[PDB]
Structure 1
Amino acid sequence: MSVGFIGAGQLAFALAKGFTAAGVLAAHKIMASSPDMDLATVSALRKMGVKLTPHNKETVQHSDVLFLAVKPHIIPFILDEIGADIEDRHIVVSCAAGVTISSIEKKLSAFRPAPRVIRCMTNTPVVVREGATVYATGTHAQVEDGRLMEQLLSSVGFCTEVEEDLIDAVTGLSGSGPAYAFTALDALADGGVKMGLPRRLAVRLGAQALLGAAKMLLHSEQHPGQLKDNVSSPGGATIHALHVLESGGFRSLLINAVEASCIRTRELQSMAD
């Protein structure tokens, strides 16, 4: 099969890199179109063997599965330009936050009546094949379309189907999640440096700590609170550190973050059409 990306930003590069590393797609079977070719993300795709074109219509013509990896306010303008080029064979996969299946279908249906649309919510760690992806199937998506989507996106991380009304919440959790983690790792490294560690060692140790804890929880049947209890000895170093996290309302900040990202995603739809 052939896969196309409209918009060659970070997410286009990340998925192409993940897909080729997974070995589920050859790089030459992938075409990306970017309105800005000076992007550093575009310089790397050329080395991979991915095809680059400045014309979105060319990507549509080359592709069977069409990822719309552009910003939510750019989604409408793409559909106007390529709507006459959508054929029965196409599955249109929109990745932009907030942009609804209904809005995509309504725009494309002005050209052909039953566009096959899937909405996707993925994140940048697909580039190391540890992404987290959910998807929802549109009105005219055949049941085999969602199965195809899941097989493709499972090659670069976790993937599962959700009702479309959960995708804004997923955006606040696993969509924005990596940025919460990068912030946390920068700060944990600052803490290690304050207590005497070289910066490079501190970044390495903090990232390994987060990776290992996450893997433990994914492979465990236990509650995260039970795993937390297992780290701490009575009167020990860890429980003293957990107290100062609690005193600052650490948990509440992370709840605030998921909520703020989810709510903003809904506002990015309230300004669309």
Structure 2
Amino acid sequence: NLYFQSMSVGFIGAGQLAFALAKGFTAAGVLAAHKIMASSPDMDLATVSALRKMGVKLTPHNKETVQHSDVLFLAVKPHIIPFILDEIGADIEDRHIVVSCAAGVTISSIEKKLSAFRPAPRVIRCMTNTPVVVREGATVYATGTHAQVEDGRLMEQLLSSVGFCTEVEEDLIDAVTGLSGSGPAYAFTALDALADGGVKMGLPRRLAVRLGAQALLGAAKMLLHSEQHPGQLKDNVSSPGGATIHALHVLESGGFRSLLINAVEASCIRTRELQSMADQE
């Protein structure tokens, strides 16, 4: 609905997240690759080589990225953000929307640094995940103190092109990190294990990987397109005395559900802990 074929996007950081978003945005056709600039500390990653081939402009100077861009994604380690903010703070102009993707880093900490330079920085905090690279990401965002109303709409329009996107209150983002931020790693672990189980029972490894991934994708899509509770879908597919209900019993006996709860909790708690350590420093 918004015309942003003239919009320039910059990434500070040229790692996994910058590649994933840039590949997703250009695959969606919402951004031309030549309108994307990325800056990296080391021009020796495979990520910067793939970005170069996409047509993304690459530079070693964070200041160049700032001057080129309208929307500026900060995709660096959480503990690097306060060094980037001190570096680029004077170059932030009124046109800029600063989008922080660093886990744990609060809007208040970013606005505090940038406000020392120019008084009303437009800041958005987001938590996205690597599946944006195949345009099936899960993203949430929260708008900062000086973010205008169209800033949030622009950001939802941009991130919706590469997956699910919705606005949340900032105090939910650490929990989202433990669920959909870390979620793909839980799935990769599960898929590796499911493939081992297929191999134990006689399947070739390549087929077992394909079938397990297709099973997970189809089940996830079923749930997304259904109004039904996941327990109801579980109920619908477990015939009496059959193979599936026998397998569900052995999952329950090992406390499978509790492990996944433990995981979301552990990732969320670590996210809160990393930020608390940063605020102390």
> With structure 1 as the length reference, what TM-score do the two structures score?
1.00
Alpha-carbon distance between aligned partners in 2 of 1:252 and 1:100, rounded to the nearest angstrom: 29
Q: Paired residue for 2:177?
A: 171
Alpha-carbon distance between aligned partners in 2 of 1:7 and 1:37, rounded to the nearest angstrom: 11
Q: Could you report, residue by residue, the CA deviation over 1:8-54 in whole angstroms, capped at 9, with x for unpaired residues?
A: 00000000000000000000000000001111111100000000000
Q: CA deviation at 1:115?
A: 0.1
2:225 matches 1:219: yes
Alpha-carbon distance between aligned partners in 2 of 1:203 and 1:268, rounded to the nearest angstrom: 35
Q: CA deviation at 1:231?
A: 1.2
Q: Could you report, residue by residue, the CA deviation over 1:101-151 in whole angstroms, capped at 9, with x for unpaired residues?
A: 000000000000000000000000000000000000000000110000000
Alpha-carbon distance between aligned partners in 2 of 1:139 and 1:272, rounded to the nearest angstrom: 21
Q: CA deviation at 1:230?
A: 1.2
Q: Could you report, residue by residue, the CA deviation over 1:70-124 in whole angstroms, capped at 9, with x for unpaired residues?
A: 1100000000000000000000000000000000000000000000000000000
Q: Could you report, residue by residue, the CA deviation over 1:219-272 in whole angstroms, capped at 9, with x for unpaired residues?
A: 000000000011111000000000000000000000000000000000111011
Give unpaired runs (5+ residues) of structure 1: none
Q: Could you report, residue by residue, the CA deviation over 1:177-223 in whole angstroms, capped at 9, with x for unpaired residues?
A: 00000000000000000000000000000000000000000000000
Alignment of 1:1-273 (within 5 A): 1-273=7-279
Q: Could you report, residue by residue, the CA deviation over 1:146-167 in whole angstroms, capped at 9, with x for unpaired residues?
A: 0000000000000000000000
The SS at the match of 1:271 is helix
Alpha-carbon distance between aligned partners in 2 of 1:61 and 1:208, rounded to the nearest angstrom: 44
Alpha-carbon distance between aligned partners in 1 of 2:241 and 2:58, rounded to the nearest angstrom: 59
The SS at the match of 1:139 is coil
The SS at the match of 2:78 is coil
Alpha-carbon distance between aligned partners in 2 of 1:59 and 1:154, rounded to the nearest angstrom: 24
Alpha-carbon distance between aligned partners in 2 of 1:226 and 1:140, rounded to the nearest angstrom: 44
The SS at the match of 1:32 is strand
Alpha-carbon distance between aligned partners in 2 of 1:36 and 1:262, rounded to the nearest angstrom: 30
Alpha-carbon distance between aligned partners in 2 of 1:188 and 1:230, rounded to the nearest angstrom: 22
The SS at the match of 2:65 is helix
The SS at the match of 1:99 is coil
Alpha-carbon distance between aligned partners in 2 of 1:223 and 1:130, rounded to the nearest angstrom: 22
The SS at the match of 1:272 is helix
Alpha-carbon distance between aligned partners in 2 of 1:204 and 1:129, rounded to the nearest angstrom: 20
How many percent of aligned residue pairs carry the same amino acid? 100
Give unpaired runs (5+ residues) of structure 2: 1-6
Query: What is the root-mean-square deviation in Å for CA atoms of aligned residues?
Result: 0.4
Alpha-carbon distance between aligned partners in 2 of 1:149 and 1:253, rounded to the nearest angstrom: 34
